[PDB]
Design a protein around this nucleic acid. Structure first.
Ligand SMILES: [Mg+2]
Ligand SMILES: [Mg+2]
Lengths: 108, 54, 165, 49, 142, 58, 48, 103, 350, 157, 146, 97, 49, 40, 266
RNA sequence: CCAUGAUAAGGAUUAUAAAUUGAAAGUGUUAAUAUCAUAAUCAAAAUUUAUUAUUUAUAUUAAAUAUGUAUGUGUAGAUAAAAUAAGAA
C-alpha cells in the first residue's frame, strides 16, 4: 500500500506512571500553562540569565515552522563564538582594526 | 425497478455481497491475463510451483 | 513663453552641423518610436517621489508618469502596454483548479495505470458505502432517480426483479 | 498473474476521509523523466542482417 | 444576507458595513446614474469624448430572432423617438418602456433616463417590520 | 525636451499663478499604469515567479 | 480530514514529518535513480 | 555503498558522492540546442520570415506585432462592407438632433 | 584584464531554496563540485596551451585572415609573414596560460580549516549573496458575516519566503564540456531546491557595410509624420533594405560604362562576373556588393501600362484583363487590386 | 446533474473551472480587442500612408468588425469573480478577504495555515514584516520595486 | 548502475565540433555510426521533444512497457516498499526509547545481515514470499515473510 | 524546473512559459573595441562617430558600454537575430559621421 | 557624533557615557495595523448590542 | 575529459594539506579555560 | 416511482458492429456500470443542453437575441418579445456574416492559437469537441448555434473532463493539431505541395525571387499556409547566390527540410 | 432542504533586564443522521441593515460611469477612543 509507509517502525513509549515533578495540576482556580516549565521559569533571572537558548552566533538558529521556538539547523551541535572569527579576534571580528561601519568607510 | 442484485447492500443473505465494488480487496482490480489456453502448469493456480518450471 | 519651435537646416548655417532634431528622427527610425505630436512642451514633470534621493521612496526611475487624466482607454496607453499572454494570469488559468492532480494527469489514465480501474472520488465513495449500510436495515425511505429513465420504465424482456420483504 | 502488480490503495473506507494520510506518493525529485531510448528485437536483427 | 432578494441572498455575507477599495464595490448599482445636471449634461455618466462611437449595444450584431429589452447603456437616438418601435429596458420590478418619445432624451444613455431608486415604494413588498422602519425615516405615512 | 519644429508651443511656467489658473484637471477616476496594471493594485501585487526583487538580468 | 485530500508535496505537515525528511536535516539526495539506463523502452509513437 | 551506517546510525553525506552524480547525470538526455554553434552568420532576410507553424512569434507589447497588424488590417478591410460600416455613429452626430447640443 | 577581473565566459548559477540554511549548504556543495571539475578542465586546456606554446605551424587560413585588408595602418596592403602571425598567436596563448594558472591556483587555496568561498581571491568559483524574496500576506482570521470591525481586528501576517545564493564562475575560454556538467547539476540538486543559469559569453558579430551601407541622408527628409502610431506597421519596412545584387546591361553599354553606372572599379565588376569575358546588350550581370550606386527593389516610380497600340490583338488599344496580366507577368487579381477605377467601371475597360 | 451522483462536496467548485476558461478567452481576445480599440479611437492620422478619408473609412470599418465578433471577451479583470479552488469561498481582490499569491480566500488561508498545509512563516501581526522593501514604503513601494525588476532594468531595443 | 555510460554523453558535443571543423560526419564507419547513433538516442533530444516529453500518457506508457516485461522494481509510482529497518540498540542504555526523526527509502544492500550470520544461499535453498496477514493484527507487523 | 513541474502534463506548458519569460537576450559591446582600423584602413568608429552613436542610442549606453536588450520574439534565437540586426543598423547610422 | 568622538579620543568616553549620550533608547511608532482606525493606536467604535 | 577527475582517485595527485573530517570539527568546539590568568 | 432527467437516449455506434459485438462481455466502470453521456442525448435534448451553459451571450439565455420563445415572465409580469425586423428600425443592422468570426492563420499566434472568435473555445484536436465522432472545425460555417457541437461548452453534461483536458494541453497544441490534421503526405508518396488556392502565391514568390527581390519574396513566403513546392526553394536559394547570402540560403534550405517533409532536399 | 466535529472577537496585577500592550473555551463556508425542488457573479443591476472615523468657505467634473444634498449660536439625551517616539503624575 502507499500507506504501508506510515506504519510505526519502533514500539512507542507507554504511559506507565504519574505526572512529572512539579506538574501543572490545577485546583479550584488555577491559571495553568502546559507550555511553561514550572521549575525553570520560577528560577531567578539573576541566576539563570535572560537567555532562552544557548548563546551562540544566531546563524546556527532557524525560526521554526509551526512552532513558536527556534531550532538548530545542525541537530544539537553547537559551535561557540570563537569559531566564527579568526583566531584571537578582538570582539569576534573579521579583522580587529575597525567595527563594521569603520571598515566600510575606511574602504571607501 | 431495483432489488438486492441492483441496490447497494453491504450484505446479502448473511454473507458479504460480492456485487459491491467496495467489498473487494483492491488488489483484485490489478490487471491480469487469461491463462487457460496455456500449458497446464503455467497457469496461475499452480503458482506455488512456478519457480520450478523446466 | 509661447513660441514657434524652430529648426535651422545645416545647409543654411555658416558651418554645417548635424541638428539635434534630425538625429531625433534617425533615432525614431532605428528603434521605431511614436512621436507624439500633441505632447505639450510645458508639461515636463519628473516624478519627484521616485526620482529624488530625498524621499525614502527612490527608485531612480520614473515609476509613474504624472498626468492626471491618463487612462486604460487611450490609444496611446494601448500602444505601450503589456499584453496578458504568458503573464501570471496564464499561470493562474492553468495551475489553480479544483483538484490539483487533474492539472498533472487525466484521473482515469492514472487510476487505470496504477490501480486496475477507475476509482470514484472520496465523496462519491462515502455516499456509496452509506447507501449500502442503510439499505441493509430500513428499505423504502428511498427514491429512484436516474439520468435516463427509459431503462427502468421499459426494462428488457427478461429482468424480473426479486420480490422483497 | 504478475506478482509485482500490487494493491496501491487501501480497502475503501472512511479512514480515507477522516484522516490526513495522503492518497498518492509525493513526487520523487531525483527520479528522471522516463523517455524512449531503445530498440526492438526486430530492429537489432535488421541492423545485423 | 438577511433577506434573499435573489439567489445570491443564500451565498453572500454582508460583513456589516465594510469598506472596499476605491471604485471597486463588488456589485455595480448605479443609484446616481440619473442625477440631473444642466451644465454637466453632456459630460456626466456619458462618453468621455464626443468623438467616440456609440457602444456595441446600439447595433444588431448577429442574426437575431428578437430581444426582450435592449441594454441600459444603449444610447437614445433620434430614431428611438421617431420610428415608433418598442424601446424597453430592464429595470425593477420588471421593465421600463419609453412610450412617450422626446428629443430631449437624444444623445444620452438610458441609464440616465431611468430612475433606479423610485420615490414610489410598494407596501406589499415590505414586511410589517420593514414598513415600520420606513415610517421612522419619514418615507411611508403612518 | 525636443519638440517638432514648426509647432507653436509653450514653455514650463515660471509663475505660480500660471499653473494654478490654467485648465489642468485633477485625477478623478481610478489610476492606471501601462506596465503596473498587470499587477492589479498595490495590495494585490501579482507575482508570476518568486525572483529576488534585486535579481539582475544577465 | 475532508473530502479533498492533502497533496503530499506542498504540505509541510507531510514533507517535514517523521515519515519524510525534516527541513533541519541535511537535504542531500537520498539514493541515485537510474531508470532509463537499466531497462530502456523502444520508441513507438501513438501517431504514425 | 560500503558505509553500513548510512542513514541508520546517522551518517549523512554533506557532499553528494561522485558515483551518484555520475548516475544522475547519466540518466537524462542533453538538449541539442544548448550546444550553441554559429559559424555562418545571422540571417537578415529569411529567418524571421520562416514557415508559420515553426515561426518566430512576437510577444508582449503590440509594437512588436507589426506583421500581424498589417494582416489584421488587410483581412478586416476585405471582410467588412462599407455598406454596413456606414451605420456606426459618433456621439456628436447623434447629439446633433438634441435641442441643445452645444454649450 | 588580468587576475580576477577578466574572462572569456561567465556563468552565474542562481540557487533557490525555501529555507536559508538549505541554500547556503547547497552552495557549498555545488561550489566544491565546480572547483574539482573546473580544475580538471582548465588543467586540460593548460596542457594543450603549453604544447601550442612549444611549437606549431600556422593555418593558411589564419594567415589569410591577417592579410585581408585593402589598407593597413601604414597605408598600403600589408604583408604579414607567417612569422609575425605566429607571434600574435603566441602572445595570446601566453596570456591564456597566465589566466589558466590563475584559475587553477585559486582552485587549490580552499583547504578544510581555511575554506572561505565568499571572497573571489580565495576560491573558484565564488559565491555572492542575493537579497531574499519575501512576500507578506495580510488576511482576516475571522469568519464573520456580521461585523467588519471584528474582521479587521483579526488580521494575521504570514510570509512566503524564498532564499538565494549565486555561484559565479569566470573561465578564460569556452568549453562545451564544462557547460554540460554545469547544466547537469540540476539533476542532483538538494531537496526542494532549484536553479537558474545565467550565461554571459563573447561572440563575434559582423557588421556588413554591404547590407547596412552608410550613405548620405536622403535628398528629401523624413518628417515627424512618418512616425505616427501604427507608422511602425504601415510606413516602414524592417531593416535591412533589399538592394539588388543583379543588374541588366543596357544596349550602348560597355564594361566601364556599366561599372560607372553601378559605382565600381572595372576590376571589381569583372571579378564578380568572372565567368563572362565580354558583355552584350540585354545580358544579366552580378553587381559587386561594394558598389555605391546599387538600386533598391521597386523604386518609388510606378510602372504604368498605357493602352496605346497594344498587342496585334488590336494594334489599336489593349482591352481585356488577362491580356494586360499576360503582358506584365502578374495575376489578374493583383492587377485588379491596384486599379479600382478600371475594375469598377467594367472588365472590358470600356 | 440535478444533484444525482455528484462527485465533489461543493457543487460551486465547478464555477472555478468556468473562471479559468474566462481567462483563456481573454488570452484569445486581448490583442485583437486592444488593436481594434486603438485604431478606432485614433484622432491623429494613422500614418503617412493612411490619412484623411481612407483613415476615417478604415476606422469605422474596424469598429464595425469589432462589434461583429460574438463572444469576444472584453470584460475587465477586476470585474471577474475571485473564487477558491478549495472551498469555493469568494473574496474581493485588494481586500483583506482575498490572499493573492496562493489565490485563496481568507477562510481557506486561515484553515490551511493553522493546520500546516501551506508553508509560511509567522511574523509579528502589527508591523511591515521581515522584508526590506515593504519596511521602507509599504505596499505601494514594494509594488514599485516589482515593476522595476520586471521592466525597467531592461533597456529595450 | 554502470557509471561509465556517462561517457557516451560526450558524443553529441563531439559531433557538433566535427561540424565546426568541416569533418563530414558521413565518413565514419557503418559500425561506428551505429554505435554513435545509439549513443545519440540515449542522450540527445531537441527543444521540440523536450516540451512534450513529460506528458503523463508517455510516462504511463513507459510504465506499461515495463509491466509487460515484468520489471517494475525501480519505477516510483509502481513499487510499494514494505520492509522497515529497525534501530540499533546501545549497551549505554536499554532504557532510552528511540524514535525515528526521518525516513528514507534506500537499497537493502546498505544494511543487510552479514553473510556469515544468515543461512547459506537463500535464493536457491529457500522459497520466500513477503505477504500480508489476512486476519486482523491487533499489534505487530502487518507483513510477514513466508 | 527540477521540482514539481518537472514530470507530468504540466511540464510542457510550464517549461515554455519559463522560456518565454526568459526571451530577453542582452547584447553588449564596449565602444573601445569599436575603435579599430576597418578593412579599408579608416578607423571604424572615431570621435565624431562615437558622439553620434551616443546621441542615437540614448539610455542604451552606460559606462561606455552599448547594451541592447532584445525582447521582441518568444525565442532566444530570434532575439539574437533581432538584436544583432539593430546593432548593425545603429552602427550604420552612427558611421555617417 | 558622540560615538565617533569616543572612537577618536578614547578617554572622552567616560564623561559621555555618564551623561547618557552613548545610551540608546529603543522606541518605535507602533506598527501599522488595519484593525485600528488611524492605522496605529485607535480602536473602532463600540456599541452595546 | 573524464567523468570523475583524476584529482579524486589518483594518489600522485594526493593533496597533503587536506585533513581528515573528524579532526577539525573536534578541534573547533573546544572552549579553552577562561581563567588563564589570576585577576579576570 | 421513476424520476429521469431525460426520457430517451441513443446508441453511439451502429448496427453491423453492435449486433455481433454484444456476445463479448465488456467491463463497465465498477462503481457506476451504466454510462449515459452527452453522445447519448437525443437531437432535441442535445440542442437544449448546448444552448444553456453559456452565460448571457449563449442562445439559451432569453435575452441573447437568439431566443425562440415569444414571451418571457419577469416577476409575474409577462413581456412580449420585440421581433428583430422591429428592433432594427431604431437599432441599425451591421452584420458582416460568418467570415467575421474567423481570423486568418497568420494571426494564430497573436491569439494564443485560435482562428475562431466564437463564444465557446474551439480546439483543433479530435477529442475535446468530440461528440460521437471526431471533432472537426469548419472555418466557413461558424455560427452561434454551433450545430456540430465542437466548441468547449463550459456548463454542459460531461464537460468537466473536457475542460480539464484543455487546461492540460501542451504549449503548441492548437497550432500543432491545426497543422497536422491538414498538411500531410498523400497516400502515393506525393507531397501535399500542390493546392489550387495557394498556387498564385507560390507563383508570385518564384517570380519575385527571379527578379532578385529577396526580401519581398521572403515576405510573401511568410503568408503561405500550405507546404510550398520545390520550385519555390530552388528560386529562393538561386536568388541568395549572387549577393553571397549564405546564412539566408542555409536558413531557407533548413526551413524546407525536416520541418516541411524535406521538400527542400533537392 | 433536515443532514455532528474545526481556527474569531472580547485589557484587569509573573514590572524592567541582555525582553512583545492581545487570551482556548469559539465567530457563515471543513470529516459517518440524508430521502421536496438545477437557483451562483463572465459586467453596467432593487437602501431597513445593531456593529460605520467623510472632503466645513481664496482658486472646485479630462478618459472604465462614479453620487443633488442637511447653511443654521461646535448647540438635546446618550455615547466612542488612548498612558506603546513621545511629552498627562
Ligand atoms: Mg462553530
Ligand atoms: Mg452555473
Amino acid at each position: 500500500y502507499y500507506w504501508s509507509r506510515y506504519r510505526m517502525p519502533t514500539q512507542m513509549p507507554k504511559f506507565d506512571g504519574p505526572a512529572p515533578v512539579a506538574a501543572p495540576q490545577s485546583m479550584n482556580s488555577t491559571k495553568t500553562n502546559e507550555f511553561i516549565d514550572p521549575i525553570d521559569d520560577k528560577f531567578p533571572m539573576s541566576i539563570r540569565g535572560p537567555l532562552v537558548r544557548p548563546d551562540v552566533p544566531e546563524d546556527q538558529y532557524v525560526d521554526s515552522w509551526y512552532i513558536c521556538t527556534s531550532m538548530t539547523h545542525h541537530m544539537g551541535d553547537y559551535r561557540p563564538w570563537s569559531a566564527s572569527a579568526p583566531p584571537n579576534a578582538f570582539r569576534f571580528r573579521p579583522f580587529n582594526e575597525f567595527d563594521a561601519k569603520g571598515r566600510e568607510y575606511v574602504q571607501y | 425497478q431495483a432489488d438486492r442484485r441492483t441496490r447497494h447492500h453491504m450484505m446479502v443473505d448473511g454473507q458479504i455481497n460480492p456485487r459491491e465494488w467496495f467489498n473487494w480487496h483492491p488488489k483484485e482490480y490489478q490487471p491480469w491475463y487469461f491463462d487457460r489456453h496455456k500449458f497446464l502448469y503455467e497457469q496461475r493456480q499452480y503458482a506455488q510451483f512456478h519457480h520450478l518450471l523446466c | 513663453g509661447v513660441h514657434r519651435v524652430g529648426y535651422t537646416h545645416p545647409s543654411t548655417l555658416p558651418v554645417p552641423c548635424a541638428q539635434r532634431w534630425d538625429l531625433r528622427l534617425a533615432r525614431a527610425r532605428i528603434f521605431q518610436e511614436y512621436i507624439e505630436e500633441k505632447a505639450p512642451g510645458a508639461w515636463q514633470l519628473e516624478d519627484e517621489r521616485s526620482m529624488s534621493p530625498e524621499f525614502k521612496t527612490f527608485t531612480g526611475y520614473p515609476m509613474r508618469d504624472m498626468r492626471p487624466g491618463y487612462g486604460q482607454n487611450l490609444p496611446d496607453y494601448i500602444m505601450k502596454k503589456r499584453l496578458p499572454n504568458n503573464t501570471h494570469y496564464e499561470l493562474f488559468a492553468r495551475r489553480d483548479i479544483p483538484n490539483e492532480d487533474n492539472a498533472m494527469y487525466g484521473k482515469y489514465l492514472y487510476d487505470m495505470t496504477v490501480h486496475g480501474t477507475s476509482l470514484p472520488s472520496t465523496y462519491r465513495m462515502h455516499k456509496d458505502i452509506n447507501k449500502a449500510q442503510r439499505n441493509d436495515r430500513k428499505l423504502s425511505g428511498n427514491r429512484f432517480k436516474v439520468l435516463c429513465s427509459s431503462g427502468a420504465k421499459n426494462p428488457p424482456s427478461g429482468w424480473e426483479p426479486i420480490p422483497d420483504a | 498473474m504478475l506478482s509485482q502488480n500490487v494493491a496501491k490503495t487501501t480497502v475503501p473506507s472512511y479512514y480515507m476521509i477522516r484522516t490526513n494520510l495522503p492518497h498518492r506518493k509525493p513526487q520523487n525529485q531525483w527520479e528522471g523523466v522516463y523517455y524512449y531510448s531503445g530498440i526492438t528485437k526486430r530492429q537489432r536483427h535488421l541492423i545485423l542482417l | 444576507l438577511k433577506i434573499a432578494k435573489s439567489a445570491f441572498g443564500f451565498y453572500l455575507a454582508r460583513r456589516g458595513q465594510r469598506k472596499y477599495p476605491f471604485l471597486r464595490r463588488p456589485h455595480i448599482k448605479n443609484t446616481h446614474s440619473m442625477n440631473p445636471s444642466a451644465p454637466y449634461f453632456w459630460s456626466f455618466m456619458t462618453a468621455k469624448s464626443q468623438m467616440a462611437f456609440l457602444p456595441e449595444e446600439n447595433y444588431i450584431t448577429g442574426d437575431w430572432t428578437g430581444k426582450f429589452f435592449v441594454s441600459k447603456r444603449q444610447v437614445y437616438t433620434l430614431q428611438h423617438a421617431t420610428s415608433g418601435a418598442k424601446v424597453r429596458v430592464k429595470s425593477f420590478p420588471s421593465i421600463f418602456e419609453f412610450n412617450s418619445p422626446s428629443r430631449w432624451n437624444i444623445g444620452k444613455e438610458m441609464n440616465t433616463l431611468t430612475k433606479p431608486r423610485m420615490d414610489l415604494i410598494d407596501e406589499q413588498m415590505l414586511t410589517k417590520k420593514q414598513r415600520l422602519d420606513y415610517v421612522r425615516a419619514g418615507l411611508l405615512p403612518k | 525636451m525636443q519638440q517638432i519644429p514648426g509647432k507653436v508651443d509653450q514653455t514650463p511656467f515660471e509663475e505660480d499663478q500660471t499653473w494654478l489658473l490654467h485648465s489642468i484637471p485633477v485625477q478623478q477616476l481610478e489610476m492606471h499604469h501601462h506596465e503596473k496594471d498587470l499587477q492589479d493594485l498595490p495590495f494585490i501585487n501579482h507575482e508570476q515567479f518568486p525572483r529576488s526583487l534585486e535579481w539582475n538580468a544577465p | 480530514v475532508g473530502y479533498t485530500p492533502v497533496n503530499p508535496d506542498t504540505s509541510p505537515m507531510v514533507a517535514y514529518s517523521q515519515y519524510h525528511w525534516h527541513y533541519n536535516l541535511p537535504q542531500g539526495m537520498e539514493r541515485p535513480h537510474s531508470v532509463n539506463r537499466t531497462f530502456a523502452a523502444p520508441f513507438q509513437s501513438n501517431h504514425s | 555503498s560500503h558505509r553500513r551506517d548510512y542513514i541508520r546510525m546517522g551518517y549523512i553525506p554533506r557532499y553528494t558522492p561522485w558515483e551518484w552524480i555520475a548516475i544522475q547525470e547519466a540518466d537524462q538526455p542533453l538538449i541539442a540546442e544548448q550546444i550553441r554553434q554559429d559559424n555562418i552568420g545571422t540571417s537578415y532576410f529569411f529567418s524571421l520570415n520562416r514557415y508559420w507553424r515553426y515561426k518566430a512569434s512576437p510577444h508582449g507589447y503590440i509594437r512588436h506585432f507589426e506583421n500581424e497588424v498589417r494582416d489584421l488590417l488587410q483581412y478586416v478591410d476585405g471582410v467588412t462592407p462599407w455598406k454596413q460600416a456606414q451605420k456606426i455613429r459618433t456621439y456628436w452626430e447623434v447629439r446633433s438632433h438634441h435641442p441643445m447640443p452645444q454649450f | 584584464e588580468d587576475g580576477i577581473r577578466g574572462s572569456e565566459v561567465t556563468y552565474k548559477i542562481v540557487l533557490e531554496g525555501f529555507w536559508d540554511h538549505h541554500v547556503m549548504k547547497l552552495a557549498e556543495d555545488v561550489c566544491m563540485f565546480l572547483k574539482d571539475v573546473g580544475r580538471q578542465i582548465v588543467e586540460e586546456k593548460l596542457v594543450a596551451v603549453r604544447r601550442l606554446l612549444q611549437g606549431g605551424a600556422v593555418d593558411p587560413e589564419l594567415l589569410a585572415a591577417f592579410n585581408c585588408a585593402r589598407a593597413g595602418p601604414f597605408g598600403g596592403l600589408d604583408e604579414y609573414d607567417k612569422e609575425e602571425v605566429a607571434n600574435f598567436l603566441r602572445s595570446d596563448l601566453r596570456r591564456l596560460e597566465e589566466q589558466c594558472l590563475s584559475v587553477i591556483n585559486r582552485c587549490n587555496v580552499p583547504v578544510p580549516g581555511a575554506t572561505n568561498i565568499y571572497d573571489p581571491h580565495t576560491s573558484w568559483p565564488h559565491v555572492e549573496k542575493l537579497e531574499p524574496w519575501v512576500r507578506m500576506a495580510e488576511f482576516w482570521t475571522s469568519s464573520s458575516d456580521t461585523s467588519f470591525t471584528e474582521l479587521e481586528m483579526s488580521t494575521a501576517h504570514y510570509e512566503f519566503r524564498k532564499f538565494f545564493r549565486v555561484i559565479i564562475c569566470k573561465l578564460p575560454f569556452q568549453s562545451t564540456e564544462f557547460e554540460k556538467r554545469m547544466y547537469d547539476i540540476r539533476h542532483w540538486l538538494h531537496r526542494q531546491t532549484s536553479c537558474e543559469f545565467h550565461t554571459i559569453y563573447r561572440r563575434n558579430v559582423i557588421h556588413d557595410s554591404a547590407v547596412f551601407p552608410t550613405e548620405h541622408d536622403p535628398a528629401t527628409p523624413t518628417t515627424h509624420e512618418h512616425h505616427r502610431m501604427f507608422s511602425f506597421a504601415l510606413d516602414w519596412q524592417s531593416a535591412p533594405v533589399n538592394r539588388l545584387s543583379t543588374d541588366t546591361v543596357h544596349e550602348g553599354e560597355s564594361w566601364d560604362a556599366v561599372a560607372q553606372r553601378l559605382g565600381c572599379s572595372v576590376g571589381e565588376l569583372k571579378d564578380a562576373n568572372a565567368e563572362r569575358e565580354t558583355i552584350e546588350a540585354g545580358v544579366v550581370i552580378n553587381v559587386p556588393v561594394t558598389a555605391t550606386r546599387r538600386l533598391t527593389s521597386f523604386g518609388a516610380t510606378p510602372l504604368v501600362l498605357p493602352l496605346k497600340t497594344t498587342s496585334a490583338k488590336d494594334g489599336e488599344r489593349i482591352r481585356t484583363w488577362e491580356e494586360a496580366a499576360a503582358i506584365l507577368d502578374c495575376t489578374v487579381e493583383e492587377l485588379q487590386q491596384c486599379n479600382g477605377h478600371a475594375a469598377l467601371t467594367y472588365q472590358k475597360k470600356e | 446533474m440535478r444533484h444525482i451522483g455528484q462527485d465533489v462536496p461543493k457543487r460551486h467548485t465547478h464555477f472555478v473551472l468556468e473562471s479559468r476558461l474566462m481567462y483563456e478567452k481573454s488570452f484569445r481576445d486581448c490583442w485583437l480587442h486592444s488593436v481594434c480599440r486603438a485604431i478606432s479611437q485614433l484622432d491623429e492620422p494613422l500614418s503617412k500612408t493612411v490619412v484623411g478619408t481612407h483613415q476615417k473609412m478604415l476606422q469605422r470599418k474596424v469598429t464595425c468588425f469589432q462589434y461583429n465578433q460574438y463572444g469576444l471577451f472584453k470584460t475587465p479583470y477586476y470585474r471577474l469573480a475571485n473564487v477558491d479552488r478549495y472551498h469555493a469561498v469568494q473574496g474581493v481582490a485588494g481586500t483583506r478577504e482575498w490572499v493573492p499569491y496562493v489565490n485563496v480566500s481568507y477562510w481557506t488561508m486561515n484553515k490551511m495555515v493553522r493546520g500546516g498545509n501551506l508553508l509560511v512563516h509567522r511574523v509579528h501581526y502589527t508591523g511591515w514584516g521581515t522584508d526590506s522593501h515593504l519596511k521602507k514604503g509599504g505596499w505601494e513601494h514594494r509594488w514599485n520595486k516589482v515593476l522595476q525588476r520586471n521592466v525597467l532594468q531592461y533597456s529595450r531595443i | 548502475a554502470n557509471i561509465n555510460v556517462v561517457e557516451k554523453k560526450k558524443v553529441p558535443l563531439v559531433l557538433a565540433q566535427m561540424d565546426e571543423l568541416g569533418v563530414p560526419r558521413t565518413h565514419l564507419s557503418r559500425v561506428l555510426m551505429d554505435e554513435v547513433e545509439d549513443s545519440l538516442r540515449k542522450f540527445q533530444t531537441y527543444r521540440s521533444r523536450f516540451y512534450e516529453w513529460g506528458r503523463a500518457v508517455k510516462q504511463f506508457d513507459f510504465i506499461e512497457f515495463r509491466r509487460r516485461n515484468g520489471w517494475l522494481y525501480d519505477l516510483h509510482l509502481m513499487k510499494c516498499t514494505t520492509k522497515q529497518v529497525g534501530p540499533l540498540r546501545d549497551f549505554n542504555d536499554p532504557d532510552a526509547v528511540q524514535g525515528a526523526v526521518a525516513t528514507a527509502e534506500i537499497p537493502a544492500f546498505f544494511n543487510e545481515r552479514p553473510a556469515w550470520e544468515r543461512p547459506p544461499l537463500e535464493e536457491t535453498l529457500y522459497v520466500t514470499t513477503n505477504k500480508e496477514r489476512y486476519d486482523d493484527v491487533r499489534g505487530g507487523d502487518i507483513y510477514y515473510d513466508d | 524546473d527540477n521540482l514539481q513541474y518537472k514530470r507530468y502534463d504540466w511540464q510542457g506548458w510550464y517549461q515554455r512559459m519559463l522560456d518565454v519569460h526568459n526571451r530577453n537576450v542582452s547584447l553588449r559591446c564596449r565602444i573601445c573595441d569599436l575603435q579599430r582600423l576597418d578593412g579599408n584602413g579608416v578607423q571604424f568608429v572615431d570621435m565624431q562617430t562615437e558622439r553620434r552613436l551616443r546621441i542615437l542610442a540614448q539610455h542604451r549606453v552606460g559606462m561606455g558600454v552599448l547594451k541592447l536588450d532584445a525582447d521582441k520574439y518568444e525565442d532566444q534565437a530570434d532575439n539574437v537575430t533581432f538584436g544583432t540586426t539593430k546593432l548593425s543598423e545603429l552602427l550604420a547610422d552612427a558611421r555617417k559621421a | 557624533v558622540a560615538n565617533a568622538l569616543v572612537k577618536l579620543i578614547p578617554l572622552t568616553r567616560i564623561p559621555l557615557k555618564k551623561s547618557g549620550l552613548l545610551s540608546v533608547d529603543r522606541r518605535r511608532e507602533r506598527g501599522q495595523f488595519p484593525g485600528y482606525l488611524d492605522g496605529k493606536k485607535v480602536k473602532r467604535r463600540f456599541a452595546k448590542r | 575529459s573524464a567523468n570523475i577527475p583524476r584529482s579524486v582517485w589518483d594518489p600522485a595527485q594526493h593533496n597533503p594539506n587536506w585533513s581528515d573530517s573528524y579532526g577539525h570539527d573536534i578541534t573547533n568546539r573546544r572552549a579553552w579555560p577562561a581563567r588563564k590568568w589570576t585577576v579576570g | 416511482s421513476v424520476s429521469g432527467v431525460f426520457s430517451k437516449g441513443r446508441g453511439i455506434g451502429h448496427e453491423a458492429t453492435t449486433s455481433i459485438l454484444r456476445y463479448i462481455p465488456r467491463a463497465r466502470v465498477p462503481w457506476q456500470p451504466s454510462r449515459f453521456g452527452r453522445e447519448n442525448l437525443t437531437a432535441a435534448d442535445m440542442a437544449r443542453l448546448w444552448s444553456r451553459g453559456r452565460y448571457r451571450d449563449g442562445p439559451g439565455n432569453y435575452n441573447s437575441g437568439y431566443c425562440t420563445e415569444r414571451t418571457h415572465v419577469l416577476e409575474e409580469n409577462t413581456v412580449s418579445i420585440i421581433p428583430r425586423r422591429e428592433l432594427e428600425k431604431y437599432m441599425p443592422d451591421i452584420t458582416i456574416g460568418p467570415k467575421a468570426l474567423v481570423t486568418p492563420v497568420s494571426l494564430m499566434n497573436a491569439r494564443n492559437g485560435h482562428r475562431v472568435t466564437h463564444d465557446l473555445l474551439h480546439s483543433y484536436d479530435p477529442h475535446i469537441g468530440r461528440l460521437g465522432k471526431p471533432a472537426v472545425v469548419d472555418h466557413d460555417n461558424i455560427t452561434v448555434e454551433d450545430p456540430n457541437r465542437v466548441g468547449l461548452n463550459a456548463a454542459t453534461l460531461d464537460c468537466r473532463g473536457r475542460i480539464y483536458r484543455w487546461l492540460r494541453r501542451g504549449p503548441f497544441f492548437q497550432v500543432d493539431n491545426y497543422f497536422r490534421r491538414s498538411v500531410k503526405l498523400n497516400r502515393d508518396g506525393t507531397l501535399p505541395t500542390d493546392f489550387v488556392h495557394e498556387a498564385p502565391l507560390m507563383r508570385k514568390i518564384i517570380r519575385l525571387a527571379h527578379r532578385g527581390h529577396l526580401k519581398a519574396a521572403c515576405e510573401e513566403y511568410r503568408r503561405v499556409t500550405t507546404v510550398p513546392p520545390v520550385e519555390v526553394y530552388r528560386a529562393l536559394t538561386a536568388c541568395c547566390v549572387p549577393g553571397a547570402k549564405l546564412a539566408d540560403a542555409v536558413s531557407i534550405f533548413e526551413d524546407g527540410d525536416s520541418k516541411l517533409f524535406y521538400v527542400s532536399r533537392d
